[PDB]
Structure formats: structure tokens, C-alpha cells
Design a protein around this ligand. Sequence first.
Ligand SMILES: Nc1nc2c(ncn2[C@@H]2O[C@H](COP(=O)(O)OP(=O)(O)OP(=O)(O)O)[C@@H](O)[C@H]2O)c(=O)[nH]1
Ligand SMILES: [Mg+2]
Lengths: 844, 56, 28
Amino acid sequence: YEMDFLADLMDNSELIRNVTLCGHLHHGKTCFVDCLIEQTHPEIRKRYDQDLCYTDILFTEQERGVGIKSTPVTVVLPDTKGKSYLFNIMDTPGHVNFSDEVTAGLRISDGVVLFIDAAEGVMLNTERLIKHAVQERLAVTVCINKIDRLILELKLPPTDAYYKLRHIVDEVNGLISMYSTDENLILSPLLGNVCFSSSQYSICFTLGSFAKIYADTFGDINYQEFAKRLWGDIYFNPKTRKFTKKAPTSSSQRSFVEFILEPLYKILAQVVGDVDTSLPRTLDELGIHLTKEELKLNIRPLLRLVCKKFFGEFTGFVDMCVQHIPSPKVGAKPKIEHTYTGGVDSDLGEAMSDCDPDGPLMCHTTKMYSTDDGVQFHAFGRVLSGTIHAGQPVKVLGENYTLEDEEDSQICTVGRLWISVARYHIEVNRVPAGNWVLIEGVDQPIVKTATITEPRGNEEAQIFRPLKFNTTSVIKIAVEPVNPSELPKMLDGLRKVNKSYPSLTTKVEESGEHVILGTGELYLDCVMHDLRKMYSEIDIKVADPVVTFCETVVETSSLKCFAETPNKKNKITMIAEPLEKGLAEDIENEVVQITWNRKKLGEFFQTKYDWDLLAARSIWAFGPDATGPNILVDDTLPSEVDKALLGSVKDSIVQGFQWGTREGPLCDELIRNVKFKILDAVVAQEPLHRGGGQIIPTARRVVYSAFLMATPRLMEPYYFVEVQAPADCVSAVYTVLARRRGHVTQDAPIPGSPLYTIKAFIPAIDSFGFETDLRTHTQGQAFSLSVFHHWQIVPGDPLDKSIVIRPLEPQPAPHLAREFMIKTRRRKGLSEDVSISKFFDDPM
Amino acid sequence: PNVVFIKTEDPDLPAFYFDPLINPISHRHSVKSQEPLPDDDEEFELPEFVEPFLKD
Amino acid sequence: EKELERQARIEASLREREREVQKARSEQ
Ligand SMILES: Nc1nc2c(ncn2[C@@H]2O[C@H](COP(=O)(O)OP(=O)(O)OP(=O)(O)O)[C@@H](O)[C@H]2O)c(=O)[nH]1
Ligand SMILES: [Mg+2]
């Protein structure tokens, strides 16, 4: 590959495809791309004993194995027979928190690739990832890595292996059909959306490349006529000399079984066994003529060499990445329709709808990458429209930016451009559209999200929606320095690391604590390592973890919280009650949004929520930030009369509710499952006394009086631990879960290999080392993984001043709720004597 | 990656023997292809003008 | 040799079935 040819192909056409991989716990990714780099960069030779990564440029992934830094790479891959294409592949880690990171980073790719283990098969990360990708409306191209782990490790026959693959594809297609009704992408076992890989042994090909091999050596026309029936349920008929999809003979297997798997196992058994005897007799028939010095290797590298000579240059995956993974000229429409805040009806929408390098520029930086000098970190981003050049200034923008809010803008000169390779970097002077560039000089004004427009002429430009994660981070940790005279360096490192890891979010509570919010234990571990080692060289102290809780109403309020305004001209009354859990999960799952007609919300409430007619028609407002489950309501006999004046002072009431839900009196945390119904609301005709000064805080007082005087109850999170392990480890996992507040959800003998997958919940309070405790007693055979996606109410009722956990015991009583209440109010600095029920009762 | 392996008993069994150890293959019942497939005319027009894969 | 292989397969299948029955009884 010549860099000049790369530049020529860059500003050539939309043939350059954009892809982002997807996998879980080493199921096919960095070894596969190491094979790709060896195919493209021949001088970069892989080792003999140890595996070569080519994706963990940093050190933490090398020392742990679990990748953290998504290292995208772009390669000249002449894998299309008689053609060539450009591929922009975004490598991805596999861990759950890092899976949320990838899901945040999957906005860029027009399509998605999956690497599933041939033996382990489906996992939990994929169970979430399929749903996430279908929610983003991106392409899907399944692939299966670690196939040598099936033929060699298990020593299965062909038919059992093919049935295993059938079951894998059936489960994947069922999950996709449950996610949505994408008939175009669904049902893809043989159309080209199935790649094969043995990354450790470079055994990687597809149906098309297989048919191409046979047509090249001694064969017939291409796979358009042959590969259309190599899939099972159709055997070969040497009598008729064709594939008998009708009733076949007895001693016959599927064309996959006898054309592909037969010689596959043949050469595997000839290279592994009989390496001294059956090597040349089997290799001079179809293989290479490697010298005697080449046969003096161990079994693994020799096998990899033979697999590489067989699949000569891996001309199989470009044949599918161009097939179904669309070009950027095609994917610009839906990607922008889903990402851009406005619709396609905007001038900028139809402008950037095509990948015009000469037009309104709309860049978007997602992942921030550091350099050898920690004081300056670059930024990677997808150029959807326009053409960036060296030294061109751009209007960097923020997530809070808006057409009216011109505060989140800051100009900056693009210093030096690079190309993402993760081992080297190619400097660039001009960048066309559909491009990934390593931006320099823009490191300062960047936030977790980033959007770019032209510094002049790009006016009337909206921004891209803030990305989701599909995994709400619940962990809360404090990080205070060793010596207190090191605050600014620690905070600078904290900000740099925040810009590095988008999943987290800095915070400083009223108690003056330096707080961090992580998704998992290993997430916070890698974060603090990169902090103390890279972004801040100061010795820092660390506390223990704690889960960020929320409040909930156990039942209806007893009395009407009458929070009257201080002007003696506003008497608000809000009675709060809970709602169905599934409806709140759907409101959080973006099922029933707020921007709908009155009839639309009415039908949604009468069908989904099963609410009353006037009840649903009287919808007041939504929850905090229009994303959380906080239902506002306003219905009454005088409410139907004087709703106009109150409607004038309803915006301030909704704002006060949204700001009060952000921090409640229970534990200074969020609130959920609250249906605040406003019954009595005196509204004065004079807006001077009835202004905002007696709108926001009176409403906040009423809301807190209803939430505190209506049988409160906390809500602690529950993870979902899927531990693939044998039966003895199953009993051990039962013991540990019983000893740590567990709840056995599902446990079954997952086929394909002996790994009984134990699916069960763990609370975050008792999740401090679930993986460590499971791997300690199970003798290293129960590598489970957790994901926080289920919040449940603790059984305590922390209102009675009778239970007190004085000593350092772990609150075995059902006063554990009050224990966590006292602990949280002591950690937050607020008044630990939470007795505002009589103070906030507001008697009248 | 829990290293899976099938530790056989003695070297009298075949090489690739399904050890009754793991589970049923799929226990599938939704597949319904008792009747012949539609790719018949082009199938007859789709010969196999090449020697087999590894018959020898 | 073929009959020996079939008998060995039957014996290993019986042994694995007994072991799996014991393991499943313990797990239940
Ligand atoms: N060669 C090979 N190795 C496999 C396979 N399946 C699992 N592995 C193991 O995984 C290693 C390579 O891991 P990758 O597939 O490259 O994983 P990864 O992309 O680093 O994954 P994460 O960092 O966990 O997201 C190999 O050296 C094996 O130890 C397979 O089919 N082939
Ligand atoms: Mg990885």
C-alpha cells in the first residue's frame, strides 16, 4: 500500500466504507485485525509465541488484556477480487462499561460487525449490543471468530458443528426480530453477512471467497450460481451432478459439511497430526511449497502459515463489507436523521444529506485521544460534510449549545491533521468528506460530545443529539488527594480523563468531595490508573464505592402538601402517587416521548398505561430533563376552570419540579415512580406577586412535602451477572449469591461447550467484587460479567427513629435502608437528622 | 477464555467423536423444510464442474 | 477395530451419563 494511492483513493468516491467492530471478552477482534495488519503491512511481522495486539497502543490493555482505548485503523485492503476498496475500521473493546463506551462510539460507523465465539456463542454484551445497534438503525454483518477453538478444542464432528452454527444464527435472528422488524438486514445466513475467522491461526474466509478459490484453482463460474445453495438443507447429487434440495440420498451431508468442513478438518488433521508423514502428500496437491526450514516450526505457527497461504490474502471480508455495509453516500441520510437535532427538512439536513466535500461543513468528534505529551490530546471525528484542511479554523461547539444559546462556541485553528493507524500516523494537508482525522490544537474547548461548523457562512446550523449509552452508570466514588495542597493538578488530570472517558462525569457535591461516576469496577480502576499515571502525577487517596440511589413513593400521600407562596397569594397543593413500573421503564427507554399531540398521548395512556380519558387528556408535563420518570399532573374541578392563569405560571412550576427531582430530601439523589397531581393551586391575577419568586420554590416545597409524606422508599440497583462455568462452579455461584443478597434468575447448560450459564441479579451494595469472589472459589472457571439495568426498591421504611446501626456491622436488619440513609447524608454533608416531614408539612 | 477441551478416555475412540458431555445440539423444531426447495431450475442449471474438495 | 471403537464409545457414553446424572442431581 502506497500512501499516495491512499490519498488518491480518499478523494476518489464513496467506495470508502466506514465500519466499527463489535465484540465481547476476546471473541475475535484484535487478533483478527493483527492478521489484517500483517496482510497490509508485511514488514510488521507477528511473533511466534505471544499474540500481537495492534490495538492497545497504551499499556493498561497490554497488562490486563481487556482493551479500553478504541484504536481505529484505516487500511488499503485489496480484498475485493479484481478490485480494491478503503475501509475505516473502528476497533472496539468488549467489557460491559467499555461496551457502553463503544455504543457511544458506534455513531460513526455506517454499519456494524460482530465477532462471536464459535464455541461460547452469544453473551450478555451482544444481548445488549444487538438491541443498541437496531435502535441506532445501522447495518449488521455477522462474523464468527475463534473457529479453531471449535474444531481442535472440542474435537466435534462436522454435522454437530454445522447445527451449532445454525443455532447461533437462529438465536441472532430471533433477537434481531425481537428488537425491530428490519426485514432487509434480518435473515442473513448466506447472503454475504456471515464471515469466518480463526484470528490466532488466520483461518478466515467466506462463501464467496471459497467459491472464488475453487473457481481459480479448478472450477466453474463464481459464487452467484454455486454459493446460493452451499448452505444446508440441500445435499450434493453426483448422479444428477447438482445440489439435490429435494429428498437426497442416505450417505450424504450438506454442501457446507462436505465441501468446506471436510477439507478444513482434513488439512487441520494433516498439519496437526502426521506433520512429518502426511504434510507434503497433502500440501503438494493444493498448498504451497514452503521450504524445509519452514516445516521446522511448531504446530501453531506452521498451521497459521498454511492457513494464510490457503486464504492467500484474505479476499473474503471486503466482499461483504461493500455488499451490505453501505457507503457513506448512502448512510449519510439515516445517520444524520438519527444524530442531528433537527430533521431532514432543514437546509443543513438536505445539504449534509449528501457527502459533498464542497458545502456546509459538519464534523463531529466523538473519541478524544491522547499523545506522548499528556498536556495535549487530539480528537478523532467523522467528517460528514465539507473538507477540512491544515490550518483551517472551525467553530467548535458543545452539547448545551443551541441556535439561541451562543455561549458554548469557541474558535480554534486546526493545527496538524493525521490519519488513525494506532501504530503510526500519516500527516494530511487536505481531507475530503467521509473521513476520520486526528485533530490537533482543538483540545481545549472540547467536551464529552463535539460538533463543528464553518467559522463563517455555516450559520443556522443545529447540532447532534447527545449520545446515549444503554447502561446507566450507578457507581459513586470519591477521590481526594493525599496531600490537600495538590488540588489543581488533581482537578486538571480529572478534567483530562473526563474528556478521555466519555461514559463518566465529574461532580462536586455540597460537601466539597471530588466525586467520580463509573459503570463498573474495572472501569473506575482503569480510569484512576490513567489519572494517577498519565493525567496527574500526584499521589491521591481513594475511598470505597457507593451506588447512586433514588427515591420512590411506596403508596399514596396521606395529606395534601399545601405549600403556600410567601406572598400570601399562591396556595399550591400536589398529591403524589406511583405508577406502573413498565410505563416508567418505557418513558426512560424513549418509548412514549413528550413531543406528541394530545390525542397521541391520550391513546398512549389509554392503551399502554390504561389511564382514563380526561386523565390522559389532562397530561401536565414530563420528568426532569424530559428523560426521567417523573409524571406531573393537574386535574380538578376548579383546575378545569382557572387553568389559564395557572397555565401562565405553569412553566415556572414545571421548571421547579424538574430542578427538585434532580435532588430530593431522601438522600440528595434522584426520584422515580412519582405521579405528582396538582389539585389545589391558587393563581393570582397580578403577576407581580404571582411571579417566579413564588412559583419555583413553592412548587419545590410542595413536591418535597408530597414525596416525603407519602411512604417513601429508596431504589437500589441490581446488576445482571451471566457466569459461564461448569456445574461445580454453578453450586459455588449459588452459594456466593445466597451469601451476597443474590437472586437466581436463570441457570442452564448452555450448549456448544460445557459452560452452565448462570444468569442472576446482584445488588451494587453487595457487588463489590462479584467477579473476584466468583473467580476465587471456582478455581478460575467462572469469569462472569455484570450490567446495571434493573432498579428495585429496598424493603426498608427509613422514617421511624427506632433503628440505629451504631457499631460497624453491615446492617443485617431491614433497617439497612436507614443505615444507607445515615451513611449517605454523612457522606454528602447535609443534615443527617432528616426530619423535615414536620418542617415541610406546611400546615394550613 | 476458559480453555475448553475434551479429555477422552483412551486412543480407541475416533478422533472427532461427540462426547456426550455438553448438551443437545440445538433441540430445534422450528425448521420446516420437509418439502423440496425452490432452487431447482437454476440448480439443474448450476452444475459442479470441478473435482471434489478433499475426496482423496 | 470398528466394533472395538463402537464398544469404547458406548462405555465412555455410559460413564459420562453416570457422571452427568450425579452432577445434575447435585446441582438440583
Ligand atoms: N486465534 C484465535 N484466538 C482466539 C479465538 N477465540 C478466542 N481467542 C483468544 O483470544 C486471543 C485474541 O483475542 P482477540 O480476539 O483479538 O480479542 P480482543 O479484540 O482483544 O477482545 P477484548 O479486548 O476483550 O474486547 C487469542 O490469542 C486467543 O487466546 C479464535 O477463534 N482464534
Ligand atoms: Mg478487544
